Amino acid sequence: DIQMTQSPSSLSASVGDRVTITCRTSQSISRYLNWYQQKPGKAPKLLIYAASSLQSGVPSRFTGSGSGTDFTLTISSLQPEDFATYYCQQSYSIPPVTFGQGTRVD
Amino acid sequence: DGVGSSSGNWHCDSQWLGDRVITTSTRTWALPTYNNHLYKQISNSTSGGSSNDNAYFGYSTPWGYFDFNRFHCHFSPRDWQRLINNNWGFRPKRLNFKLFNIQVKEVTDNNGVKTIANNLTSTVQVFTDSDYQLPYVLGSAHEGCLPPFPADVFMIPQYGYLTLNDGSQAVGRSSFYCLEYFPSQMLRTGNNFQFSYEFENVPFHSSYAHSQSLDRLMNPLIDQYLYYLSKTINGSGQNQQTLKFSVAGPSNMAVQGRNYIPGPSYRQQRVSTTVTQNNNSEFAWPGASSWALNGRNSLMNPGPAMASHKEGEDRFFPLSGSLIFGKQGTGRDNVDADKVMITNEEEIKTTNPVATESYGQVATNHQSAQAQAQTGWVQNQGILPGMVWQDRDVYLQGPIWAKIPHTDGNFHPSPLMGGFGMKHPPPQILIKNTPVPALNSFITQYSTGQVSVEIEWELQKENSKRWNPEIQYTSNYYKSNNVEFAVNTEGVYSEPRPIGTRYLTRNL
Amino acid sequence: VITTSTRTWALPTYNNHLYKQISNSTSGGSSNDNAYFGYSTPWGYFDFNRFHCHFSPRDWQRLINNNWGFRPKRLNFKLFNIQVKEVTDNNGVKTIANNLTSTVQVFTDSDYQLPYVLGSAHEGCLPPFPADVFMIPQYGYLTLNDGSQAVGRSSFYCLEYFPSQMLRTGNNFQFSYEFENVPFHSSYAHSQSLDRLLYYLSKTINGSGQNQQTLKFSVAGPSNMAVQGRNYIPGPSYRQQRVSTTVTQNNNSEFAWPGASSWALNGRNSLMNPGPAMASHKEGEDRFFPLSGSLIFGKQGTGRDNVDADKVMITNEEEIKTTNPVATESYGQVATNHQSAQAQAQTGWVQNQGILPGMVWQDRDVYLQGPIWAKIPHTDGNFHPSPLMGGFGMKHPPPQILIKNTPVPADPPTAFNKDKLNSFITQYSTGQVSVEIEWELQ
Amino acid sequence: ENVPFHSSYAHSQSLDRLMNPLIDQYLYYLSKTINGSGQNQQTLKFSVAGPSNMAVQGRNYIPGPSYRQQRVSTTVTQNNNSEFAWPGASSWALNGRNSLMNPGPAMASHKEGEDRFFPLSGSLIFITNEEEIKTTNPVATESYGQVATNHQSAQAQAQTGWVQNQGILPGMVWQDRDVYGPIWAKIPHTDGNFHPSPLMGGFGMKH
Amino acid sequence: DGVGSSSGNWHCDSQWLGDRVITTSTRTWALPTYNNHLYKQISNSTSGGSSNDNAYFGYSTPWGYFDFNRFHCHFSPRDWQRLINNNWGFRPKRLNFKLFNIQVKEVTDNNGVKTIANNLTSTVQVFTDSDYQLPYVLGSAHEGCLPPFPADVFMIPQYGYLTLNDGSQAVGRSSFYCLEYFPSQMLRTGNNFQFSYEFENVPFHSSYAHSQ
Amino acid sequence: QGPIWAKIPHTDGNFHPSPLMGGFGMKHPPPQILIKNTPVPALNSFITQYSTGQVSVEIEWELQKENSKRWNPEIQYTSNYYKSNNVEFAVNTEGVYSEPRPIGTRYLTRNL
Amino acid sequence: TVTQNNNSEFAWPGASSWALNGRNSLMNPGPAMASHKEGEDRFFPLSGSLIFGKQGTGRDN
Amino acid sequence: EVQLVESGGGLVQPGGSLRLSCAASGFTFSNYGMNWVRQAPGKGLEWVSYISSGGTIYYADSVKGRFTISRDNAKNSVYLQMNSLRAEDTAVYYCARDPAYCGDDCYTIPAHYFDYWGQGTPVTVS
Ligand SMILES: [Ca+2]
């Protein structure tokens, strides 16, 4: 089971700031990394799939980059709307899909 | 007839008449000059020839050729739906070909600016090989066929052929063909060309899936009058040998006597769609089923017609068993699995063995008091009397016909990539621009024209007494950014998925 | 020869005039190999597909002694003297009375639109003895399944959706059928053998020692007949395990299913039975028989389950050993390598062999108790369509003949109710069937 | 009686070269199963089958059937120093008696470039060679090809096996044996036969 | 014609010919005796009539009737699929009706055990109203039509009708219909009944969805 | 499952008489077919009696064929391939016939 | 989805009807109208469409 | 648009059994693979089980042998039958769609990333 660790477990930021979240995996998962945000009580929504791509219907500010063991999610021009927990999951080794512990943005 | 008079009209449509379909397609083509009007010997060592399995020898010619041998040339996606949902079978009958509105251009490069103008006195040469005296390259599933979407303008492919070789060198038996040594009709901008062809009798392609399986043909309510060997021992111990016999009946259906057995198999390696499940080694060529000819290994592709996977195992696919098509805009080399469309023939599982499974088991010895019964797996099985099988399916993107090689013998000549095998298929149609000398110096020149092909198809209507409704091919009901089988915002036409012909059902 | 058989039949009411989904689930047998899905129908059907229906043991003797071959030509079928009985159980005992106005429905499937079950060698044929009265078997069919479940490609047939002829007690039914041209069944044993109908390599070494390699060639002649060149080779083989009629000789283990030769289709294993036509045993061994490779008939009164070897009749194919390989033997040997100064010639046994150009073979023999015809499945291709249990394979075999008692309801309620009627009069029918086949002789 | 004309020509093309060398196929093949390097590098990469790689292209027809012969060199020092004429012979058993397979199914006597080898019982010896048919027919001394013997998995590597004999498959073509030799043969009187043309060459006839 | 001779055969199938479809359905029916051979005035107050919107007045009759007015009577699910996927419109043209193999039974209750036997001399009365003089109840989406599956045996529904009312009472304009006052063909177990009908010209039903 | 025809009420006027539950409105629809058992007196006392018979109906339908020039494929009515306990529009194990869903007639398309 | 509906009995009170000679009849199914807007599949007209029973469905409630 | 709404859930005694359903609308349900994932209260996301269009089924190790996943395409529903529930099974279970779908005649390449989810249902084992 691939283990995933998002580095800044908690993050504090203000509107307009550049936020950067990264996770690392124990074994290479190639380019298969997916990012989710979850607001408290809501169901999570897919933001970025396949490491660097972007899901339809989601703001352009979100970006992703990485391969192998290092992937990064970078929120640009942070707004009031996107303070949430963010999760990174890998669709490479299946079964089972694994998820990151979670990172909070304040 | 004249420079200012059109030599033909635009015909595209389908006429559904009773048991027949008549499809007509008209395209606009552009023919360049190939090889600067030269025949050139080609071989592998020119490209470096690093592998003996890839070694070839042959010739490239200045001529081009017209290829209509894919189904989406003749059928819109709606006409293909109208075909496969309502019909148990089809096959071609007549062919009618026309080449018209010829236009020859001349190209001049003066400093940086090119300039193109009409050359009204230039000719185009065209002939068909109706005695089949040239090497026949149309049954190899090559690119360069008329585009599926009628508004696309396509480039005519260059004709070439291969002959015998040893390494990259030739042998005494190798043949050379000058295509100028064929009489050919010459055309100026007012001339047109046409010919008609009669398909030779072929069996109807079966566009249906069986509603029964080869091993379930029995009446489930009634015993057989045959007996089978149920027990070789009475129980645990020594010297328990016995012979017991039971009626083969509804309760044990595996042991019943059967009149017919599934068709032949040549086993394929099994590859999984989910990548981690596959072995961590390079087995694409090493673990592949192949056949050897004169010391060269050729991959077995797609091979004998076999079911792609067992019931309930969608992820697995035979390594070279299925036809794989590219999606619109897919690269040439090392594209990902989501850039290709892997067709799966799971509908032939009823009569055909699974491609990735053994055909069965045989006994490998004589049992005795000192020897247990031993069995072994049949990895490949040739034809046995009493076998039945289905051929491979045809697709909207797939080939139509192949030429049956001219040989002493063949068995079930139906071609392995799908379609109709023929000893005299539609003939090759060769075309070139006649060289105009400015002798190795010529006027830079190309031509353009409209080509229309009409084919008459015979239909086999569905007679079924089935009570419940069939499976049908259908478009998706819900919203999406684009319409499937339409253009996008940039004007690119795409075929979203491969479409097979087998929806309606029959009894086995 | 023109054979004619008349019998008397009794037709019950099957499934209380209902179509019913059946599967291994309803039966309760879990195994994947035996899983099935299908339907049982209220209809019965006539089956004359065994030879002893049309032949007396004398006629069969008269046929096989004097003739090299035979094959059916025409068919004629009649159904007459229909009698419909009603059964009324009042308290203890039941009374049977004629119902004059009741009907019996019959039709032939002459477009071959129903599943064809007459090629599976089933009970319920016309009995071999003309004074026997037989029960008509129930019609049912199987469809595609996954486990005990149907898939979307599974089909359901309502036989009521076929036009049928309705017969009261005075009406009769008949039709005639033309067999399609089929090859004469061979009913003879070849006197000669395939191998007993130019140079060869005699010696690869001069003698014992080192560097003795040589090539010597000798004439092929009557002295050594194994090495002579031949134009034809024996037919295909798929090996069967060998079993002995003397139980002591056989291994002390349960190898009946484990040791069986079979074929896999969509993940389910089926026994290879009887399989390709092969010789039952070598010359001189009558105690060995192939495991699944022969037809096995029950003797009169033999039980259904686990009966000893003296209760069953095991046929043997030894007649065809001239052109066909033995079922329990390998086909031959092949070279597995390239010999060299460093490597000895290696060989391996051919356990199964498909068709090769130049093969000749014999089909399986037909028996007085055995089947006559089968339906060739409707497919893109087939090879030597002759059925593996014996007989004449046909794409348009004699059609199925389906028959049921027309349901007669009991008294309905006095106020309207939209439900279908589940209350019917207990009823059955009986009558006569005659089937005439014209045979051509060689 | 009516019989097929004996072919007295050698194919100028081989069954695996029938393609147009200048053009790609519209079909793809599986080029790579691993990205490269070491652990956890599984992928599926596909490429167009084209002139650069002619082995992996899809083909409509395949070579004829084979029953392998042991290979014997005309140079005696090359051959194994043992008696293998009978022991290392390809044979077929009938009723418990072994017949040598002679001459056997029609196959190419040797690969292109090796003229010093011949099938043990493959060619008629008055030593003729069938090399003309190497275009549509497999070599007599070679395997027909390879088949997979297992399901690969993350645990199990892909395994192949050599096909020593191969019966008829749909889509095979082949050439019969050449005539030099006999003319006609009688087809045995049987329920069935396949491609009755006799194996020593010439015209098969039911009469 | 006779007691032991069938008066008709079983016809079920569809024939797809060009621009036409011919569907044939055959069912087995059972007709009881309704109202003990009586005409009976019915209204709401017999059932208690608590609501004025539900108030009715009319008559129930001993007669039954045949209703084939639903589509699954004439079409299997496969024939319906074959219709709707390939065609922009359809409409009926001709109608052909047959009633045959009549069987009349008699029921006797002796102590607890019932006994049923044939009554060969009994008749069944059948007529069609082709002048449309009776109240027409077939266009009210009622139950009692031939079953969709051909192997089902169905019960014939009881005919009844409504006329004018005020509350549960009648008015002077209300009409009463005796269905015996119609000539009707009488049938014993050897007789059969048939008639043919020509649909009047109607527009095609539009079986398509607009794409704009 | 729906109705086929209705009878257009006999009135001075109507507008677009097509019936509101669906189907074909007609001034002279298929006529009613009335049936009863003739009373057999044992007069209020009778023999308890019922009848049973076979009924057959045949309709000829005229079709309007689809002429469309649409390039892409239509929506069609289809069965679902995936495995299930029962076949849709078939009997179950107890022999009961069911119609799983209501099926409309509108799949093919036209221009407005 | 029943919790989206008002918490009251409106089957008869809120229904569209027509009156004839002082008797109210429900308007069923009524003029032919689209059942719902594009994108809303969970709403249906109160008496707007034809409702069929499944096999074995009871008579009441 | 695409909607997933799951029902079931609520209190169950340890060792008990519960059946979660997920009703889908706005897309053709039979074309897509469906997933159950669960989030424990005050805990991270965790994947439970998968079923594809053609019936490939996966389970997580912690859950295997106990829960069973199935789908009914006539009702547009995916079911999770949870047996032998334990106090670690307390979570909010979500239904998530897998976007991958090529067609009837070709293999689909499973994406194993979830574009659309349910609102969740709580399951409390006590
Ligand atoms: Ca397919």
Residue numbers in the entry:
A (entry chain L): 23 to 128
B (entry chain C): 219 to 656, 667 to 736
C (entry chain A): 239 to 435, 444 to 688
D (entry chain B): 418 to 543, 560 to 613, 616 to 642
E (entry chain F): 219 to 430
F (entry chain F): 615 to 656, 667 to 736
G (entry chain F): 492 to 552
H (entry chain H): 20 to 145
What does the paper say about this structure?
The AAV vectors are composed of non-enveloped T = 1 icosahedral capsids, consisting of 60 viral proteins (VP), and package single-stranded DNA transgene cassettes. A major challenge for the utilization of AAV vectors in the clinic is the presence of pre-existing neutralizing antibodies (NAbs) in a large percentage of the human population. The presence of pre-existing neutralizing antibodies in large portions of the human population poses a significant challenge for AAV-mediated gene therapy, primarily targeting the capsid leading to vector inactivation and loss of treatment efficacy. This study structurally characterizes the interactions of 21 human-derived neutralizing antibodies from three patients treated with the AAV9 vector, Zolgensma®, utilizing high-resolution cryo-electron microscopy. The antibodies bound to the 2-fold depression or the 3-fold protrusions do not conform to the icosahedral symmetry of the capsid, thus requiring localized reconstructions. These complex structures provide unprecedented details of the mAbs binding interfaces, with many antibodies inducing structural perturbations of the capsid upon binding.
In each map, the capsid was well ordered, while the densities for the Fabs above the 2-fold axis could not be interpreted for model building. As for the 3-fold antibodies, only a single Fab bound to the 2-fold region, in two potential binding modes, resulting in distorted densities during icosahedral averaging. For the sixteen 2-fold binding Fabs, this strategy resulted in maps reconstructed to 2.54–3.56 Å resolution. The localized reconstructions with C2 symmetry relaxation confirmed that only a single Fab is bound at the 2-fold region. In all maps, the VH and VL chains are well-ordered, enabling the building of atomic models. The epitopes for the sixteen 2-fold Fabs comprise VR-III to -VII, and -IX of the AAV9 capsid. On the aa level, all 2-fold-Fabs contact D532 and Y706. Furthermore, for all the 2-fold Fab-complexes, movements occurred in VR-IX near the 2-fold axis. Additionally, at least two Fabs showed the presence of a bivalent cation in the binding interface. Future characterizations of the mAbs will confirm if capsids treated with EDTA will prevent antibody binding or reduce their binding affinity.
